[PDB]
Protein backbone atom coordinates (compact mmCIF):
# COMPACT_ATOMS: atom_id res chain seq x y z
CA UNK A 1 0.00 0.00 0.00
CA UNK A 2 0.87 3.55 0.20
CA UNK A 3 3.20 3.59 3.44
CA UNK A 4 4.51 6.93 3.11
CA UNK A 5 4.77 9.14 6.16
CA UNK A 6 5.95 12.49 7.23
CA UNK A 7 6.94 14.02 9.94
CA UNK A 8 5.68 17.60 10.46
CA UNK A 9 7.70 20.54 12.30
CA UNK A 10 6.56 22.11 15.56
CA UNK A 11 7.51 25.28 16.75
CA UNK A 12 6.97 26.33 20.05
CA UNK A 13 5.52 29.53 19.85
CA UNK A 14 3.73 32.13 22.58
CA UNK A 15 1.37 32.42 20.38
CA UNK A 16 0.71 32.25 16.34
CA UNK A 17 1.49 35.37 13.98
CA UNK A 18 -1.41 37.70 12.58
CA UNK A 19 -3.20 35.88 10.04
CA UNK A 20 -3.65 32.95 11.96
CA UNK A 21 -7.06 32.60 13.98
CA UNK A 22 -6.09 31.88 17.89
CA UNK A 23 -8.73 31.95 20.54
CA UNK B 1 -3.15 5.41 45.73
CA UNK B 2 -2.50 1.87 44.28
CA UNK B 3 -2.62 2.04 40.74
CA UNK B 4 -3.81 6.07 40.33
CA UNK B 5 -1.87 8.33 38.19
CA UNK B 6 -1.14 12.11 38.00
CA UNK B 7 1.32 12.91 35.52
CA UNK B 8 -0.44 11.28 32.46
CA UNK B 9 -1.59 13.71 30.30
CA UNK B 10 -4.99 14.65 29.75
CA UNK B 11 -5.29 16.39 26.38
CA UNK B 12 -8.74 17.95 24.79
CA UNK B 13 -9.06 17.74 21.01
CA UNK B 14 -11.75 20.38 19.84
CA UNK B 15 -12.28 20.44 15.82
CA UNK B 16 -13.57 23.13 13.71
CA UNK B 17 -14.45 23.62 9.98
CA UNK B 18 -13.35 26.70 8.16
CA UNK B 19 -14.42 27.77 4.79
CA UNK B 20 -12.19 30.16 2.27
CA UNK B 21 -9.45 30.31 4.81
CA UNK B 22 -5.74 29.86 4.41
CA UNK B 23 -6.72 26.69 6.37
CA UNK B 24 -9.84 24.48 6.17
CA UNK B 25 -9.66 22.63 9.34
CA UNK B 26 -8.61 23.96 12.96
CA UNK B 27 -7.70 21.46 15.12
CA UNK B 28 -7.11 22.17 19.29
CA UNK B 29 -5.26 20.14 21.49
CA UNK B 30 -4.50 21.00 24.58
CA UNK B 31 -3.32 19.57 27.75
CA UNK B 32 -4.99 19.86 30.70
CA UNK B 33 -4.71 17.40 33.70
CA UNK B 34 -3.91 17.65 37.58
CA UNK B 35 -0.23 17.16 36.59
CA UNK B 36 0.65 15.57 33.61
CA UNK B 37 4.84 15.14 32.39
CA UNK B 38 4.97 16.02 28.76
CA UNK B 39 8.16 15.27 27.45
CA UNK B 40 8.54 15.77 23.39
CA UNK B 41 6.14 16.78 20.55
CA UNK B 42 6.97 14.88 17.45
CA UNK B 43 3.96 14.69 15.09
CA UNK B 44 3.68 13.43 11.87
CA UNK B 45 1.07 13.25 9.20
CA UNK B 46 0.91 9.49 7.29
CA UNK B 47 -0.78 9.54 4.30
CA UNK B 48 -1.18 5.78 4.06
CA UNK B 49 -4.05 6.65 6.64
CA UNK B 50 -4.56 10.42 5.82
CA UNK B 51 -4.10 11.22 9.64
CA UNK B 52 -1.84 13.76 11.71
CA UNK B 53 -0.37 12.06 14.91
CA UNK B 54 0.66 14.09 17.28
CA UNK B 55 2.22 11.34 20.23
CA UNK B 56 1.85 7.86 20.72
CA UNK B 57 -0.65 8.83 23.31
CA UNK B 58 -3.81 10.29 20.42
CA UNK B 59 -3.68 10.96 16.76
CA UNK B 60 -5.50 14.04 14.81
CA UNK B 61 -7.54 12.26 12.01
CA UNK B 62 -7.98 13.84 8.99
CA UNK B 63 -11.25 14.07 6.84
CA UNK B 64 -10.57 12.42 3.26
CA UNK B 65 -12.63 15.32 2.08
CA UNK B 66 -9.43 17.47 2.49
CA UNK B 67 -6.37 17.03 0.98
CA UNK B 68 -3.71 17.28 3.81
CA UNK B 69 0.19 17.42 3.09
CA UNK B 70 2.96 18.18 5.70
CA UNK B 71 3.61 21.93 4.21
CA UNK B 72 0.34 22.50 4.64
CA UNK B 73 -0.29 21.36 7.94
CA UNK B 74 0.80 23.88 10.20
CA UNK B 75 1.38 22.86 14.29
CA UNK B 76 2.23 25.03 16.74
CA UNK B 77 2.30 24.22 20.21
CA UNK B 78 1.63 27.54 22.49
CA UNK B 79 3.91 26.68 26.20
CA UNK B 80 2.09 29.25 27.66
CA UNK B 81 -0.89 27.80 28.12
CA UNK B 82 -0.36 24.39 27.01
CA UNK B 83 -2.29 24.01 23.93
CA UNK B 84 -1.34 22.62 20.25
CA UNK B 85 -2.72 24.73 17.68
CA UNK B 86 -3.31 22.71 14.39
CA UNK B 87 -4.30 24.64 11.26
CA UNK B 88 -5.08 22.71 7.84
Redesign the interface.
Known amino acids: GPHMSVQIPVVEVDELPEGYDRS | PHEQQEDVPEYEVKMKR ?1 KG ?3 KL ?1 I ?1 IENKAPNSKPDR ?8 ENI ?1 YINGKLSIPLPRDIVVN ?1 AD ?8 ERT ?2 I ?1 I
Open positions: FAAYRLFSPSYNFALAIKIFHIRKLYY
